[PDB]
Amino acid sequence: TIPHLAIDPFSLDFFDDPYPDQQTLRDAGPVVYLDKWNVYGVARYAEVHAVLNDPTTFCSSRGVGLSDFKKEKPWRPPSLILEADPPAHTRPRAVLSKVLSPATMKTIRDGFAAAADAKVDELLQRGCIDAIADLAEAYPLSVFPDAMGLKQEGREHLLPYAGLVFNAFGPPNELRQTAIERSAPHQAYVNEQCQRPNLAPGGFGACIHAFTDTGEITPDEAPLLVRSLLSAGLDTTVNGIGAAVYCLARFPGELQRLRSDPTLARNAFEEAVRFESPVQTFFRTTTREVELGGAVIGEGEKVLMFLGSANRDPRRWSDPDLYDITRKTSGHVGFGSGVHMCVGQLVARLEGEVMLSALARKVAAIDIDGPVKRRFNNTLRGLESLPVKLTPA
Ligand code: HEM
Numbered sequence: 001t002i003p004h005l006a007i008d009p010f011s012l013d014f015f016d017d018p019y020p021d022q023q024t025l026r027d028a029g030p031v032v033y034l035d036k037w038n039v040y041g042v043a044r045y046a047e048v049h050a051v052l053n054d055p056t057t058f059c060s061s062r063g064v065g066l067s068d069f070k071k072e073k074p075w076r077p078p079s080l081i082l083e084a085d086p087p088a089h090t091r092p093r094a095v096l097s098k099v100l101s102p103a104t105m106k107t108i109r110d111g112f113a114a115a116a117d118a119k120v121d122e123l124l125q126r127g128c129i130d131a132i133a134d135l136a137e138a139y140p141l142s143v144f145p146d147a148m149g150l151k152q153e154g155r156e157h158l159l160p161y162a163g164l165v166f167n168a169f170g171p172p173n174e175l176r177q178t179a180i181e182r183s184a185p186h187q188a189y190v191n192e193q194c195q196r197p198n199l200a201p202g203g204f205g206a207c208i209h210a211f212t213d214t215g216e217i218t219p220d221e222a223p224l225l226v227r228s229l230l231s232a233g234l235d236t237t238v239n240g241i242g243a244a245v246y247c248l249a250r251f252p253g254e255l256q257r258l259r260s261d262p263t264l265a266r267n268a269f270e271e272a273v274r275f276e277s278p279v280q281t282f283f284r285t286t287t288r289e290v291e292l293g294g295a296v297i298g299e300g301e302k303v304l305m306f307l308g309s310a311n312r313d314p315r316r317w318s319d320p321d322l323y324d325i326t327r328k329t330s331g332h333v334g335f336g337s338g339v340h341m342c343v344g345q346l347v348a349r350l351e352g353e354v355m356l357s358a359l360a361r362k363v364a365a366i367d368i369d370g371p372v373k374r375r376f377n378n379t380l381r382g383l384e385s386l387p388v389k390l391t392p393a
């Protein structure tokens with residue numbers, strides 16, 4: 001029989017220090033009942049990974065946040081890709097995949113590295129820098145909206161927009177409800193840049209709109225796939241990169257390790273995604289009666305998956321609380337797993353690698369010199385400010 005926990009994985013307290021709670025979450029039982037929100041949760045690597053790889057049983061089309069789309073109105077029209085099941089998923093999925101293939105990365109790869117090299121140089125010129133706003137936020141801001149082919153004007157909405165989207169997967173918090181109350185300007189901006197007339201020749205939005213021509217997607221579909229990349233494509237990478245730098249900061253020996261061997265960049269990043277897990281949690285909904293870690297769970301029940309917890313399960317990882325940039329990271333669920341696994345992963349790693357590469361060649365120490373402020377959001381873990389003094393090589 002399934003234990004009750006009073007933990008609220010969406011309270012400021014939990015965000016501020018999740019690690020003791022996530023350990024109660026695991027130790028309690030393979031499946032737990034969260035009184036705060038009347039839902040089942042699963043925090044161990046094994047359970048999380050299983051749920052992820054049975055989309056037939058654990059569907060996403062009833063929402064991947066708490067809210068059940070069968071029971072209640074989605075807060076916005078649903079994603080053609082996040083909030084759908086195969087087969088409706090498979091087409092929109094395949095398209096975004098071509099858009100963001102390794103072929104594509106090869107073409108934009110030099111540009112991303114050069115821009116990464118430029119930021120780290122400028123930063124070394126100043127010394128004291130905010131690792132979040134001046135790097136984590138600034139770098140993908142200098143590469144991604146361009147890769148998208150966004151205009152200049154409006155971009156200040158891209159981050160609040162992400163925040164809104166990720167806050168909304170959560171329970172009906174103060175966090176959620178406020179985000180929603182404040183959402184109109186952010187949606188109008190995104191709705192606008194979602195249109196073909198507004199996407200520069202040769203960028204993702206443009207490349208996406210091309211699938212209109214051949215018919216792989218309709219014109220209603222097209223603005224909505226773009227919408228996908230404008231929700232998911234930015235703040236994720238802000239927090240990913242954010243994690244990496246914070247890790248390097250807290251783990252100076254691991255920085256020295258990376259400097260010794262700069263080819264360890266890609267994986268020092270991947271490790272950071274495991275170790276922080278910028279995207280913390282997602283739900284599914286049972287499509288049938290299913291036995292899940294010994295419990296028989298009824299049809300149409302929501303299950304909360306602790307991604308971060310999975311990624312830090314002692315049952316799966318030696319010394320999981322450690323930053324180890326030569327860890328065999330393969331199998332972490334930082335970008336999820338299976339049919340829905342992050343279609344954007346190549347862009348993220350692209351950014352995380354070039355930037356960690358630039359750092360490994362350019363910086364000799366990263367020390368935090370200041371107050372460190374966390375940002376609170378229902379789905380995203382990350383920092384709001386991280387003051388560091390960069391010392392040059
Ligand atoms: C720090 C980098 C990133 C992280 C940690 C991350 C996280 C995730 C996770 C955990 C999923 C699985 C969702 C699920 O199982 O329901 C996912 C899927 C997705 N990601 Fe990412 N992501 C990142 C970067 C990106 C980027 C750069 C893009 C756009 C270029 C993107 C676009 C998407 C989209 C559209 C999906 C839904 C795919 C599907 O359901 O088939 N992500 N991401």
Ligand SMILES: CCc1ccc(C(=O)O)cc1
Pocket residue numbers: 079080081082083165227228229231232236279
């Ligand atoms: C990375 C999480 C995420 C993935 C896809 C969407 C979307 O399709 O709007 C929104 C969020």
Ligand SMILES: [Cl-]
Pocket residue numbers: 076187190
């Ligand atoms: Cl929207």
